[PDB]
Amino acid sequence: PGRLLNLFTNVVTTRNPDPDSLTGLKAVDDVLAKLSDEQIFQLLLRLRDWNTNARTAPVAQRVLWALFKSHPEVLDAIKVYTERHYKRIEELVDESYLVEYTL
Amino acid sequence: EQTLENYIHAGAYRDAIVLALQLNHPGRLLNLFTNVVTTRNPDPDSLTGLKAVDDVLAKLSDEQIFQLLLRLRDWNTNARTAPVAQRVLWALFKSHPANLNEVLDAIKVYTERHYKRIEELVDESYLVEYTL
Amino acid sequence: QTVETLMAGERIAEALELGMTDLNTIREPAETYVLNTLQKIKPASLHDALLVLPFSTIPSLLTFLNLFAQRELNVPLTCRILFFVLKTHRTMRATLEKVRANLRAALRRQKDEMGFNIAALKVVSMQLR
Amino acid sequence: VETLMAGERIAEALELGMTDLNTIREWEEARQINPNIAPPQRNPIPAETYVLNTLQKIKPPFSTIPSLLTFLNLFAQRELNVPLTCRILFFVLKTHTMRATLEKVRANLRAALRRQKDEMGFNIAALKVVSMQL
Hints:
The complex is a heterotetramer, with two copies of chain A and two copies of chain C. Chain A is mostly helical. Chain A has helices at 2-12, 26-33, 39-51, 57-68, 75-102. Chain A is 70% helix and 0% strand. Chain A is globular, with a radius of gyration of 15 Å. In chain C, 81% of the residues lie in helices and 0% in strands. Chain C has one domain (1-129). At the B-C interface, α6 and α7 of B face α5 and α6 of C. Chain B: Component of the ASTRA complex involved in chromatin remodeling. Chain B: It is found in: Nucleus, Nucleolus.
């Protein structure tokens, strides 16, 4: 399951990705389109586990975003950390305003 | 008198704005800026949307800058007139370097609230997006 | 007795017909009209006003909404109208995508712009000894 | 005082990285004249991930800066450790013609930021709807 995280990191960090694709590869997109309702679950379990940690969060967010565009108590645990990150990024944006002004 | 200003208004914007600054009321000035910013077909190179406005803004000296600043605060308080005032403000800043604390603090204060409401709109719009 | 406020909501449908027909006339200010008649409406019950709105008028309404969005005309109202149209209900999906796109563009515009302004106000106030 | 060693560490990483980048740039440029060429010669076995990792190992000169800007813009383009990149841009601007490069970098940064911000907004919205539908 660690190498899963590894591959998920690689597919979204590609030097140059296929445009018009969620993750960046139509294959793994097709993959995330089809799972067994107990595969998707394990996947988002690992997505929670990774979303907890800052450095691996954006990849888990990409995977989660790809997953959220494909389908109709744990989602809480994802939501909270996701909102935390959202605020962190908002702060980054305020800084971006300062930087934008200086020049 | 005022009608000369009106004919400059039937033509040239620089003196329209200079004269409007010189003499009350600022309502016609607000009208000017509004027609400049909200135009159906603007100028992508320009700040406000029309070169001459940016020009008179940068050519503006100290007193006009301060007065127009005051009017900018005034227009900023009202949520219907806020957008226009914000564009004019942004343009003025882009045209003049970091060269009274009252008007600056006030403008900051109302502007921050505005920014907040816009953020709220952005969240609502995230919802609007996922539903679609 | 609210039902008549709903008909008051229907009053803007006529404004939509007027504006759209006028637009067709010009094809060979009118959006300011539909807009102003839209802003003249009371903040409450307009949810119900759009709820009871006829199907024929909505494409016209969408056209005027996108026109507002692209021209940055009263962005909050346009957003609220869009969300209500969506909450109360194939190609119209595309039209909605267009109007919502222009809306978000307008939002990102004003937000980034105001961010710039706030930062500036902070700096010049700070450099004011 | 150890920050001096860290500084020479990142300066060397900049020389190595910029040289490698130029090597591949030249390779691809000259790959256009004849497809059949031997591959380039890189020192260790890429290519920004190195500079990134040697930049992430440190705990929180003028000549070296343009190269650093190139790699900064490169981080921005690949969505690579955006907080670090933003902090770096802010620090570079805070101390010390190149201004246009800075405009480029900040543009790419703001873009990356908006992308993932919108992405997290979407994910949160979805999470709310699906939680509500439970």
